[PDB]
Amino acid sequence: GADGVGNSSGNWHCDSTWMGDRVITTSTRTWALPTYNNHLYKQISSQSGASNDNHYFGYSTPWGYFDFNRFHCHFSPRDWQRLINNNWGFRPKRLNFKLFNIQVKEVTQNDGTTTIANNLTSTVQVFTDSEYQLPYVLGSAHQGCLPPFPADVFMVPQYGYLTLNNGSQAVGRSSFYCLEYFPSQMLRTGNNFTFSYTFEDVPFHSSYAHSQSLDRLMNPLIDQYLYYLSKTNAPSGTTTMSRLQFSQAGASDIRDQSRNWLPGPCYRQQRVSKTAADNNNSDYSWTGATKYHLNGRDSLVNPGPAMASHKDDEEKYFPQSGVLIFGKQDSGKTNVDIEKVMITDEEEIRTTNPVATEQYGSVSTNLQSGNTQAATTDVNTQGVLPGMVWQDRDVYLQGPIWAKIPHTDGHFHPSPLMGGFGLKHPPPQILIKNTPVPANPSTTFSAAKFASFITQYSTGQVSVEIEWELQKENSKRWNPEIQYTSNYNKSVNVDFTVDTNGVYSEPRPIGTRYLTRNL
Amino acid sequence: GADGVGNSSGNWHCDSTWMGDRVITTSTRTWALPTYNNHLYKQISSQSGASNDNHYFGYSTPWGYFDFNRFHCHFSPRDWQRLINNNWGFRPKRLNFKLFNIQVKEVTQNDGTTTIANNLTSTVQVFTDSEYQLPYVLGSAHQGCLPPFPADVFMVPQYGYLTLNNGSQAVGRSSFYCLEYFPSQMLRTGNNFTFSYTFEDVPFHSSYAHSQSLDRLMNPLIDQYLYYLSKTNAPSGTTTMSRLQFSQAGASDIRDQSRNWLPGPCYRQQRVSKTAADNNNSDYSWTGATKYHLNGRDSLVNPGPAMASHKDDEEKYFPQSGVLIFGKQDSGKTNVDIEKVMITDEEEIRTTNPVATEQYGSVSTNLQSGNTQAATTDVNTQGVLPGMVWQDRDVYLQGPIWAKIPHTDGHFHPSPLMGGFGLKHPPPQILIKNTPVPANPSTTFSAAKFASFITQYSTGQVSVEIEWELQKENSKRWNPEIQYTSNYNKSVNVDFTVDTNGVYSEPRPIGTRYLTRNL
Amino acid sequence: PKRLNFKLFNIQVKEVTQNDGTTTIANNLTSTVQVFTDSEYQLPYVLGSAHQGCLPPFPADVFMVPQYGYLTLNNGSQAVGRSSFYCLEYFPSQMLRTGNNFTFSYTFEDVPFHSSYAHSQS
């Protein structure tokens, strides 16, 4: 599609369509793109005095990129409610992306007074990295996605990446990418850009909670035909003697029944309380944290493998670094109080996954004998074993959607730990840049590269449409289920609306696990 | 269908199927039918000392009848939740009824010891009153319907009716019906009985609440171009003078705007409080009640025309006789305390219908003049006016479904006041009776009618399947809606389940109006 | 395993009378039994917990059918809102009098062979 100056190159599409087992969400936003880095590539690195754990080396490019990797970019709160109250699972199917109504504007800063004017002949460059040749920076939970509220205008974030480093320096293996070394399409006002994408096959996300516990799967009315060791000594005349005795497990001793499965793996975290007085009076945010050690550096495990946030009757507690934490509206960046953030809770999976702040279990450490008593120890970290079952972390209305699976020789259960769908060929990155326009050149030749350009930026509309496949529930449960609902009581503001000043805000995080399912 | 003694004449069908805009509910129960009235018709009438308001005359027949005119006969609590959380309306479409696996058993009471045996040759008579020739006693909220829990066995209720009376006596116009004067099908063990029925066209029941008020439909930003009388006098020198002044209504005086519609009709009720101390210390249950006068008798208006139960911030109040009141499990019959009943609430319709315990409005009563001030009075009863709009009473999981519209010359908005669908040709009545089997007769002829029969009863299964048409919601609301949900907190029993003794109970009444709609 | 066939037949229903400490048992030719297979896995699956009540190993033994029951979520001795309750009468089931039978078939999915060997090397 291409036409003149006075022709819109696209329309505004924003709604959702529910049809059978599909739902199609399309959203449109308006964006603004500045000139980053003053048209330059720049090597960046960590500060000289930074600790060894915080060293890095990389580059920052003059390009921007579009990002729609959060659920609230596509679902309204009402649409999210429809989804989670009536379906056991869902997954993305295909995607459509469109960029249109480009406007480039030049700025003049004469005498502290700014004048903005159209530049009808300038252009922007766009290309999609459909072969995954650039370092993939999506899927790191960065800011700069499409806004949740359709009436908001957002700035396009700048592209940059990191490569191998040795302290603050680079090594011979580190690679540098010039994004101008890709074929890209140049658009003037009156051109548009589209492409399509098909998701690979992925398992449905489990939008349910189990109505049974992994340790409670037996018939409570019938005993087992297997025996377990129930007593190791028996009373003799005024004393005891070693004597093995066996029993069949029933309901009275349900903890001893033979079982076929084991709970999911574990990697223990430290426990903190939402009540301030319960926590220790010290700075253990890093010393008491759970981390992994890679190439001599320590890195915080956050949020880590999916484990239950707490056991029953203990909502006040949560793992130190084991849950997603969103910020309330207009909360700051650094060292905000607990009233400014929204802490998620993964308690629905405590039917199969162990609690994040307890041990996995206990194993024996010695060989008991006539003169040696049996001894056990706690297991604070347990890799996977044959016979384990578990659930993955839940997804949230304002959480990520997908993540690119790293191209490696091996990987196990490649669902991203922050939640979502792991894809070997995720939706490609979409890079965009204003073409530089040089200022008045000299009338005598000079071989030095240009350094004076016309100050300008661009704006336009972006739209993205995604088809999702649904998995309808088929329960024979008799009593009603738990549903997500709004409270009826009066209030000064309605949730998920704007306030008197025009600020849209999301008052709480919303998971997906409300319906139930048998184990 | 017909076969031997050792052949089941039907299977057990009980589940629900959701497909697009239809839902098909089928339920099966087992019933027991005694011998009523000892095989006789009997004239019945009110007691001689009864008050004039309680006089009646009629007959009781030896027949039983099947009744499935409550919603919980067809919907499980989980199915009811599905319905009310995702649809704006519904209505019945067609019906299937089946009676099978009949067993007749004879009882012998020798010496205080009861012996029960099969009687393979005895029969039962069944017929459906498909031409509406008998007095229609369904639709009066009587007990004896199919139980809500499928595992319960229920007794078939006895059939009886009332006709015209003059005090305790009858008149020449009163009519008597012999049910043996109908063609009926006789079933032995091994026969079954089926029929089908199609509902006439009826409007969908409104399963929504209005998200706007009838008096708040304007644009709050723009004034009207019409004027209203805003002041009738103006200040003169140290005094006032009559002087008419007019203004255009805006947001500051929103109560004065010109409007196109009026709230629904009214018939005022007395207000009582759920807090005991707020009510008067007297017996006003009948003296303070609202009633209608028909043929010299007073009859309580219950529940009457649909009006809101209370205004906002007043949940403690409810109209004396203006709401449906269900009883909790195992509550008594007479003079039970308020903790034993479940009082419904119709507050969702206060956007269009007036509050049941307030006046409809005020009208002027005189002609003001130089020496006469204007006077107004309250309107406690208001018939319908051109331009009125209103909502009908909600339906409940344990409330009635339909009612037969009386065959009269005229009627207005014939939706039954207890809630549900008004039908001119409702589902027909289904009468059933054990055929009498005479005992040992004398060996010499006697013309007197028989009076000694073999004591016996019957049992079997009954199934009913109904197709319902759904009306899906199509809202563009942004914020999430209110949904019916279970509470998550711990409890001794789960709602809508059985207790430790096996008693199924419904802990609260459940309406239909959770989704919202613009006015 | 590859495939499975199941059959239920020769049903007899008998009524008991306990008059005066003396028991009398008689046929009840018109009574019935209900049978259904949970072919969509909608009920809590209690098989596979090594419970008693299977078919006896010796073909000449007569066995009692075990009672069905299940557990759901609990908080101590109490339940929670998430716990679910199942009414088995809420399923379509076939009713059999003496003279009716009940059959169905089933095909196992693909599974690896069970290793009926021991390794002769370490």
mmCIF file of N, CA and C in Angstrom, chain B residues 443-484:
data_model
loop_
_atom_site.group_PDB
_atom_site.id
_atom_site.type_symbol
_atom_site.label_atom_id
_atom_site.label_comp_id
_atom_site.label_asym_id
_atom_site.label_seq_id
_atom_site.Cartn_x
_atom_site.Cartn_y
_atom_site.Cartn_z
ATOM 1 N N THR B 443 -69.198 -64.231 48.344
ATOM 2 C CA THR B 443 -69.648 -65.215 47.373
ATOM 3 C C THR B 443 -71.119 -65.069 47.022
ATOM 4 N N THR B 444 -71.834 -64.159 47.670
ATOM 5 C CA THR B 444 -73.202 -63.826 47.307
ATOM 6 C C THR B 444 -73.238 -62.383 46.832
ATOM 7 N N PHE B 445 -73.993 -62.131 45.769
ATOM 8 C CA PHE B 445 -73.934 -60.836 45.110
ATOM 9 C C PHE B 445 -74.409 -59.721 46.029
ATOM 10 N N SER B 446 -73.756 -58.571 45.919
ATOM 11 C CA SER B 446 -74.126 -57.370 46.651
ATOM 12 C C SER B 446 -73.908 -56.168 45.751
ATOM 13 N N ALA B 447 -74.907 -55.295 45.671
ATOM 14 C CA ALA B 447 -74.819 -54.158 44.768
ATOM 15 C C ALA B 447 -74.056 -52.987 45.362
ATOM 16 N N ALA B 448 -73.744 -53.025 46.652
ATOM 17 C CA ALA B 448 -72.968 -51.955 47.257
ATOM 18 C C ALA B 448 -71.586 -51.892 46.629
ATOM 19 N N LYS B 449 -71.051 -50.683 46.510
ATOM 20 C CA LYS B 449 -69.733 -50.534 45.919
ATOM 21 C C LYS B 449 -68.668 -51.093 46.851
ATOM 22 N N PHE B 450 -67.553 -51.504 46.263
ATOM 23 C CA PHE B 450 -66.497 -52.137 47.034
ATOM 24 C C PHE B 450 -65.861 -51.152 47.998
ATOM 25 N N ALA B 451 -65.431 -51.658 49.148
ATOM 26 C CA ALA B 451 -64.803 -50.829 50.158
ATOM 27 C C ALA B 451 -63.537 -51.440 50.734
ATOM 28 N N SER B 452 -63.168 -52.649 50.329
ATOM 29 C CA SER B 452 -61.979 -53.315 50.841
ATOM 30 C C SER B 452 -61.042 -53.603 49.682
ATOM 31 N N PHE B 453 -59.843 -53.039 49.739
ATOM 32 C CA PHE B 453 -58.866 -53.196 48.680
ATOM 33 C C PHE B 453 -57.563 -53.713 49.257
ATOM 34 N N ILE B 454 -56.698 -54.180 48.364
ATOM 35 C CA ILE B 454 -55.366 -54.598 48.764
ATOM 36 C C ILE B 454 -54.488 -53.369 48.929
ATOM 37 N N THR B 455 -53.853 -53.249 50.087
ATOM 38 C CA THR B 455 -52.975 -52.118 50.339
ATOM 39 C C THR B 455 -51.730 -52.223 49.478
ATOM 40 N N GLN B 456 -51.479 -51.205 48.663
ATOM 41 C CA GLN B 456 -50.305 -51.261 47.812
ATOM 42 C C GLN B 456 -49.892 -49.861 47.401
ATOM 43 N N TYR B 457 -48.649 -49.759 46.947
ATOM 44 C CA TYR B 457 -48.092 -48.512 46.457
ATOM 45 C C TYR B 457 -47.212 -48.830 45.262
ATOM 46 N N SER B 458 -46.620 -47.796 44.685
ATOM 47 C CA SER B 458 -45.790 -47.972 43.509
ATOM 48 C C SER B 458 -44.576 -47.065 43.579
ATOM 49 N N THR B 459 -43.574 -47.414 42.784
ATOM 50 C CA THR B 459 -42.354 -46.634 42.710
ATOM 51 C C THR B 459 -41.764 -46.777 41.320
ATOM 52 N N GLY B 460 -40.802 -45.920 41.020
ATOM 53 C CA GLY B 460 -40.192 -45.940 39.707
ATOM 54 C C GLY B 460 -39.298 -44.742 39.512
ATOM 55 N N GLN B 461 -38.878 -44.548 38.269
ATOM 56 C CA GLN B 461 -38.021 -43.437 37.896
ATOM 57 C C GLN B 461 -38.762 -42.473 36.987
ATOM 58 N N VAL B 462 -38.366 -41.211 37.051
ATOM 59 C CA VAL B 462 -38.914 -40.164 36.204
ATOM 60 C C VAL B 462 -37.757 -39.336 35.679
ATOM 61 N N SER B 463 -37.839 -38.931 34.421
ATOM 62 C CA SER B 463 -36.807 -38.103 33.823
ATOM 63 C C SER B 463 -37.450 -36.989 33.021
ATOM 64 N N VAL B 464 -36.810 -35.829 33.026
ATOM 65 C CA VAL B 464 -37.289 -34.668 32.292
ATOM 66 C C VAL B 464 -36.093 -33.956 31.687
ATOM 67 N N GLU B 465 -36.194 -33.625 30.407
ATOM 68 C CA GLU B 465 -35.130 -32.965 29.665
ATOM 69 C C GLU B 465 -35.686 -31.689 29.058
ATOM 70 N N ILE B 466 -34.968 -30.584 29.229
ATOM 71 C CA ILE B 466 -35.405 -29.282 28.746
ATOM 72 C C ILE B 466 -34.270 -28.639 27.969
ATOM 73 N N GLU B 467 -34.598 -28.079 26.814
ATOM 74 C CA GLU B 467 -33.656 -27.291 26.040
ATOM 75 C C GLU B 467 -33.901 -25.814 26.308
ATOM 76 N N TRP B 468 -32.832 -25.072 26.562
ATOM 77 C CA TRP B 468 -32.917 -23.652 26.848
ATOM 78 C C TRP B 468 -32.133 -22.881 25.805
ATOM 79 N N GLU B 469 -32.686 -21.763 25.364
ATOM 80 C CA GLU B 469 -32.004 -20.879 24.435
ATOM 81 C C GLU B 469 -31.321 -19.770 25.213
ATOM 82 N N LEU B 470 -30.061 -19.517 24.889
ATOM 83 C CA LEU B 470 -29.256 -18.524 25.579
ATOM 84 C C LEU B 470 -29.157 -17.257 24.750
ATOM 85 N N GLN B 471 -28.877 -16.151 25.422
ATOM 86 C CA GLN B 471 -28.636 -14.873 24.768
ATOM 87 C C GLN B 471 -27.309 -14.354 25.294
ATOM 88 N N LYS B 472 -26.273 -14.445 24.469
ATOM 89 C CA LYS B 472 -24.929 -14.116 24.913
ATOM 90 C C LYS B 472 -24.766 -12.616 25.080
ATOM 91 N N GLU B 473 -23.929 -12.229 26.034
ATOM 92 C CA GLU B 473 -23.667 -10.820 26.263
ATOM 93 C C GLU B 473 -22.659 -10.300 25.248
ATOM 94 N N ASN B 474 -22.761 -9.017 24.931
ATOM 95 C CA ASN B 474 -21.934 -8.390 23.912
ATOM 96 C C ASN B 474 -21.423 -7.046 24.397
ATOM 97 N N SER B 475 -20.934 -7.002 25.630
ATOM 98 C CA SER B 475 -20.635 -5.730 26.268
ATOM 99 C C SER B 475 -19.282 -5.193 25.833
ATOM 100 N N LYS B 476 -19.179 -3.871 25.767
ATOM 101 C CA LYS B 476 -17.917 -3.183 25.554
ATOM 102 C C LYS B 476 -17.390 -2.537 26.822
ATOM 103 N N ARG B 477 -17.860 -2.977 27.980
ATOM 104 C CA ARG B 477 -17.393 -2.463 29.254
ATOM 105 C C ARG B 477 -15.920 -2.795 29.454
ATOM 106 N N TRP B 478 -15.184 -1.853 30.040
ATOM 107 C CA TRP B 478 -13.743 -2.029 30.175
ATOM 108 C C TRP B 478 -13.381 -2.741 31.471
ATOM 109 N N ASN B 479 -13.868 -2.248 32.597
ATOM 110 C CA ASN B 479 -13.528 -2.831 33.881
ATOM 111 C C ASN B 479 -14.258 -4.152 34.081
ATOM 112 N N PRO B 480 -13.710 -5.044 34.899
ATOM 113 C CA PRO B 480 -14.353 -6.342 35.108
ATOM 114 C C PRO B 480 -15.707 -6.206 35.784
ATOM 115 N N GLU B 481 -16.513 -7.247 35.637
ATOM 116 C CA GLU B 481 -17.887 -7.262 36.104
ATOM 117 C C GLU B 481 -17.985 -7.980 37.441
ATOM 118 N N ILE B 482 -19.178 -7.978 38.003
ATOM 119 C CA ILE B 482 -19.461 -8.751 39.202
ATOM 120 C C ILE B 482 -19.900 -10.144 38.792
ATOM 121 N N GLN B 483 -19.351 -11.152 39.453
ATOM 122 C CA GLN B 483 -19.677 -12.535 39.157
ATOM 123 C C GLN B 483 -20.083 -13.220 40.445
ATOM 124 N N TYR B 484 -20.902 -14.255 40.332
ATOM 125 C CA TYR B 484 -21.178 -15.081 41.493
ATOM 126 C C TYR B 484 -20.003 -16.014 41.734
#
